[PDB]
């Protein structure tokens, strides 16, 4: 299942989804980073290549592994790179994901879980990319090391939403 995360703001699933809707609407990021989610180096490279373009970014981690970090590595990404939101695709089902996510919510970060697998047709992921597109998304930044599945999906996404795709 997927988890979308935003940092704490001065400002349940239904209300929570609307808060993320409002966020993407106000932020209007120009880039989305697609990375595997294990190597921080890879995410670091792609983030730099986004600031270099003066693009605000969302991060999409396609093959995220929880390890023993309890999502502390996602929090560190907010701090170090200033991503407006982070999406992680996990091997967990929704109920376990919502459960595991409780730890990051304890720190003020808002997190919303929805069902799905990275390889499968996902309408919620389409809703996110579409809304990003509607609000000004310009480019997909493919970090080094992506699987051919994600690379191919990214190219189709660039074609669908009329985006530049950067490697």
């Amino acid at each position, epitope marked *: 299942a997927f988890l979308i995360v935003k940092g704490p703001s001065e400002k349940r699933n239904h209300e929570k*989804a*609307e808060r993320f809707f409002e966020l993407l609407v106000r932020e209007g990021v120009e880039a989305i980073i697609i990375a595997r989610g294990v190597s921080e180096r890879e995410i670091e490279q792609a983030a730099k290549l986004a600031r270099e373009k003066g693009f605000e970014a969302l991060a999409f981690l396609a093959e995220y592994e929880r390890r023993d970090r309890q999502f502390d590595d996602i929090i560190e990404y907010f701090e170090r790179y200033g991503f407006k939101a982070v999406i992680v695709a996990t091997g967990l089902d929704e109920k376990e994901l919502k459960q595991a996510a409780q730890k990051i919510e304890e720190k003020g970060f808002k997190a919303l879980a*929805f069902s799905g697998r990275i390889d499968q047709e996902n309408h919620n992921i*389409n809703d996110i990319f579409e809304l990003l597109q509607r609000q000004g998304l310009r480019a997909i930044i493919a970090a080094t090391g992506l699987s051919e599945r994600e690379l191919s999906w990214a190219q189709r996404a660039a074609q669908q939403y009329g985006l530049d795709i950067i490697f």
Partner: nanobody
Amino acid sequence: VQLQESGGGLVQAGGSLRLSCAASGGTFSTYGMGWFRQAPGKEREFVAASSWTGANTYYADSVRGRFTISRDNAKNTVYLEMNSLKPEDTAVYYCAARRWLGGSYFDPGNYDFWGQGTQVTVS
């Protein structure tokens, strides 16, 4: 959210018919708009659905090629253009609203708001 269908009626096989559904409510609550249909004795089933921008549209296999969904967001109206109508297409057609990030467009349980239905009869 408030929804209201129009455009239903009687048509001959091979004939065309255009459905309209006027929606009130915001972009979040009506991000996805869909058409479902129900014949007597049968379950309400998915027909066609569109995202807000139309960049994602979904169709029942029984219906693609023949039916085309579209939206006029300025009026928050959704249309279903039905061509090459078949008698098996006879049913009450309902429009429905699915909030942003509401899950699969195919599943009627993901639509929180429903219209009152418009009868479509193909003889």
